[PDB]
Amino acid sequence: MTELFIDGAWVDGAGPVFASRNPGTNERVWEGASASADDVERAVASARRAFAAWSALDLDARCTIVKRFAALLVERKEALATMIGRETGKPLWEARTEVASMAAKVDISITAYHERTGEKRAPMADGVAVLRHRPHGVVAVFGPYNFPGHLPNGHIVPALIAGNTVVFKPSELAPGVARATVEIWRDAGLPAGVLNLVQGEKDTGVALANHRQIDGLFFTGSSDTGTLLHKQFGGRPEIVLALEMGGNNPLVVAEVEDIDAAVHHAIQSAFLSAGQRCTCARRILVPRGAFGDRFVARLADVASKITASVFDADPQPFMGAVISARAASRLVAAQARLVGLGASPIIEMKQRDPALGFVNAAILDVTNVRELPDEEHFGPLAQIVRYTDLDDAIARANDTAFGLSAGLLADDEQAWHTFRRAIRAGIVNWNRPTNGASSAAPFGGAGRSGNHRPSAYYAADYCAYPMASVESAQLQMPASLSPGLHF
Amino acid sequence: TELFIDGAWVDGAGPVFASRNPGTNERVWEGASASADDVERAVASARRAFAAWSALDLDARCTIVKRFAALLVERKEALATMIGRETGKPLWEARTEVASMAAKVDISITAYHERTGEKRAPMADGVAVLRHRPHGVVAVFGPYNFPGHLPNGHIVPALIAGNTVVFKPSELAPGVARATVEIWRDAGLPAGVLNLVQGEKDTGVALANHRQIDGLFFTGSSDTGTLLHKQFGGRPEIVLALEMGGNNPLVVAEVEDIDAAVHHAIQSAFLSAGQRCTCARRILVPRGAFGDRFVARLADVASKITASVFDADPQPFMGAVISARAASRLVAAQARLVGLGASPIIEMKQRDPALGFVNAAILDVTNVRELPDEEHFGPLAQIVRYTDLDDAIARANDTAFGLSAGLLADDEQAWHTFRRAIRAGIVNWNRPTNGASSAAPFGGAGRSGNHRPSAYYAADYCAYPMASVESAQLQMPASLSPGLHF
Ligand SMILES: [Ca+2]
Ligand SMILES: [Ca+2]
Ligand SMILES: [Cl-]
Ligand SMILES: [Cl-]
């Protein structure tokens, strides 16, 4: 079928055909022609044409549309959740929560727009000071596979509210989800050209990123890809880049009474979404000694009972297959590399079937690795690091160029204050999973995890620029003139 | 001893340089610059001081910056005098630059609380907490046009947030920077929190290439800022704030009060001898009788503008430009444009080849087929004659820059059309283009910035948000996610 959405219509792409496969069954989910360079040109040209009339609308007219989109997401939740499940492996129970996050994004983004990029007037001596915020123009949005609905929506909704038009390039691993999402935008009444969908693989991505008529590029993906993008835009400060990248996130465990609650939060942190959330814990730092040993044993016990199954299994699994058979193979390979370097498995990762994305929830003790690779997380291979005192835990925690999330499990509030003041990261929790977050707070990694353009609540900030005016309805001479002015 | 490192004045190891009053050519400041090793020591000192400074109570940091503001007001005449001597700026105007430096403080405190404050709110599983953290050591590169106010616009908010600073001033305004740093010292800034590396190109390169700075906050030309941007490509982890120049249009439309329009045009084009970042480079004036009368009145008044030494009695409207070389460069730019078919209305001359004095000049560029899109640096105002408001708007927007713009027009409808279409960060109606509220964001679009607006929004690049969910009581949830077995 027609798979590109350009200028208000589904059109056929000119580029090579590709497919997505359900990592749990290997059944094809989506298959279609990609967007060639010319298709991308048409998509951008369409966004550019539509921008004048979209940005010229009243704010409330744009808001009415995004709110309609939210209401349709709720109505069509099960179907969209099912597509996310089928295509990416994410369990149906979790997929539903992603859709709920997509809908909830709208009202939060309207509130953020008014808070961060609103409109204000104040008297001043020679007029009225007026602050407005204006959209940049055409923005490219690059989507990921881990939250193929929620994370692109976190760029798209604030971008649209502000009055930008959009060219959306979804991950090649979640084109079906993107199609289903664009369908709902269309039914919500979004005008022709305001959102354009270019499905594709690396060539489609490269063509969009290299286009000279885009005003911004909002990216969610790996630090390696994000960094290359950043390099590619060096010397073009006029393009706004928002790069939301990955991490090497630490979870520090210290003395707690409720050891099972700590284990629970560590399990959520390491293995929710099969370890594929940007904020998942890659390193779990646990003290040497008797308490630390009890924690590891209890963590291994519960983790060994983690069920990994097809997305619509009954009973529902905690996690699904990772995004692909290829990713599962890379994780196993990553474990073998670390074992090469002296790591010792607690729960060894195995890929159940080379054709599928199933790998078990795994725990690798990396304490004896001399120079621990500082590498981005992409699956449920938890690294245990044994430490001495809290100061040692903190130094280890911070031993990374990344800085997305971090957490502390501890009853001692004083350990929290020490930890939180020393740790360098954008999302930092106490006695919660590292993947816990307020939907109404900013979300931005430090170091290589970002480019100081936090998203979520602060997405507004990169979706519009301030335009400050002094307005004087009456033109008037000043009563007294600067020296040297003779009228 | 002209470098300020770890709370003391120390000798630089780099080559000696000097600043000169562009009005008389008399030397104003002279001293040894900071070598690569000197810059290393300054950064190390800022790094040493960071932990105790960031850990200090916000109220204690604010006390010190408010004392700085109070001392600026106390010592206004001396600091204004140094700005005037060194850069040519008339004393009357230099006084106002010091006033803006002082006003920056209370506004930056308010901005910190509003944009980078602290919030707490209930959540199902604990308390959502929003804090903001400083980056660490930040390099600040100063310009010559506002050699006190524009660096202060980075330094004040950076310090409030808890960053430490290494300040590299324009080599054309080292004395102003020394005088400012002496006031910071008297304000009680702790040792190492602010460090001063005076110098020329090599000093600036060593600081910008330092791998242990966390941010670089720059005010200067688009050419230099863009080269810095390129230098950081591939290093997204470093916060760059680039406040660059413009090719700012002022559109004139039908007004009854032609003299007021001319006044605002004069202020826009010639205040600070055209060297404000927000000064009008192009004045767009309609064809026809009204526009002809405006141009005639503009030329009549502009012809009587006086440029003189900073301390002249009577005071001049404007001074020399920053250097004899910059003066020479403006007259050459005029000749280039005349070669492309421009015609002088008031021709620019350089008074004396050893001095920075040029007159307030007006050049008709309407006949230039391909008008160069270049960043402004002096009092050479370009007249462009247009047809209707849509044509003025198209021409106004015909630039890769986007710092300021203005409309002079009685009709509110013309304003509505104008402001909805113009692409710029500072856009005024019936005011000079260098009109600004001190309490508003200040950031240019296109090549005029990198979407890190300063002034009120400087707070945003001086601290990063850290968002937390805190549950002081650790607990299992109500019901477990599926597939969890305890
Ligand atoms: Ca680091
Ligand atoms: Ca432009
Ligand atoms: Cl803190
Ligand atoms: Cl507007």
mmCIF file of C-alpha atoms in Angstrom, chain B residues 87-90 92-93 144-145 266-276 279-280 305-308 317-322 326 330 348 356-361 376-381 434:
data_model
loop_
_atom_site.group_PDB
_atom_site.id
_atom_site.type_symbol
_atom_site.label_atom_id
_atom_site.label_comp_id
_atom_site.label_asym_id
_atom_site.label_seq_id
_atom_site.Cartn_x
_atom_site.Cartn_y
_atom_site.Cartn_z
ATOM 1 C CA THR B 87 36.551 52.175 23.458
ATOM 2 C CA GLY B 88 35.547 55.723 22.433
ATOM 3 C CA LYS B 89 32.051 55.525 23.874
ATOM 4 C CA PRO B 90 30.854 58.955 25.058
ATOM 5 C CA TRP B 92 27.084 59.948 28.894
ATOM 6 C CA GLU B 93 26.484 56.607 27.181
ATOM 7 C CA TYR B 144 34.309 45.445 22.645
ATOM 8 C CA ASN B 145 30.983 47.178 22.036
ATOM 9 C CA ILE B 266 19.031 57.961 14.158
ATOM 10 C CA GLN B 267 19.155 56.119 17.469
ATOM 11 C CA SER B 268 18.829 52.784 15.644
ATOM 12 C CA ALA B 269 21.578 53.440 13.102
ATOM 13 C CA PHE B 270 24.051 55.639 14.948
ATOM 14 C CA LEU B 271 23.850 55.138 18.725
ATOM 15 C CA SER B 272 27.230 53.724 19.913
ATOM 16 C CA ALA B 273 28.415 54.788 16.437
ATOM 17 C CA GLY B 274 26.453 51.921 14.948
ATOM 18 C CA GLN B 275 28.302 49.286 16.995
ATOM 19 C CA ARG B 276 25.439 47.845 19.071
ATOM 20 C CA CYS B 279 21.811 48.729 15.461
ATOM 21 C CA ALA B 280 19.912 49.048 12.146
ATOM 22 C CA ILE B 305 25.689 64.559 14.268
ATOM 23 C CA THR B 306 28.916 65.220 16.118
ATOM 24 C CA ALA B 307 31.517 62.516 16.777
ATOM 25 C CA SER B 308 34.149 63.444 19.300
ATOM 26 C CA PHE B 317 26.185 61.974 20.259
ATOM 27 C CA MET B 318 28.713 59.381 19.254
ATOM 28 C CA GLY B 319 32.411 58.571 19.560
ATOM 29 C CA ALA B 320 35.080 57.175 17.331
ATOM 30 C CA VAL B 321 34.544 53.533 16.372
ATOM 31 C CA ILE B 322 36.669 51.004 18.282
ATOM 32 C CA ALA B 326 37.669 49.485 11.925
ATOM 33 C CA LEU B 330 33.953 50.892 7.027
ATOM 34 C CA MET B 348 31.527 58.503 5.086
ATOM 35 C CA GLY B 356 38.717 55.778 14.764
ATOM 36 C CA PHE B 357 36.590 58.779 13.824
ATOM 37 C CA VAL B 358 34.105 58.361 10.988
ATOM 38 C CA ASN B 359 30.965 60.457 10.427
ATOM 39 C CA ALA B 360 27.379 59.187 10.614
ATOM 40 C CA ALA B 361 26.847 58.136 7.008
ATOM 41 C CA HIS B 376 27.181 45.412 10.840
ATOM 42 C CA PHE B 377 30.050 47.154 12.714
ATOM 43 C CA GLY B 378 29.757 50.951 12.370
ATOM 44 C CA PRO B 379 27.717 54.014 11.413
ATOM 45 C CA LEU B 380 27.203 53.281 7.663
ATOM 46 C CA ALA B 381 23.442 53.115 7.341
ATOM 47 C CA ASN B 434 18.155 48.937 20.071
#
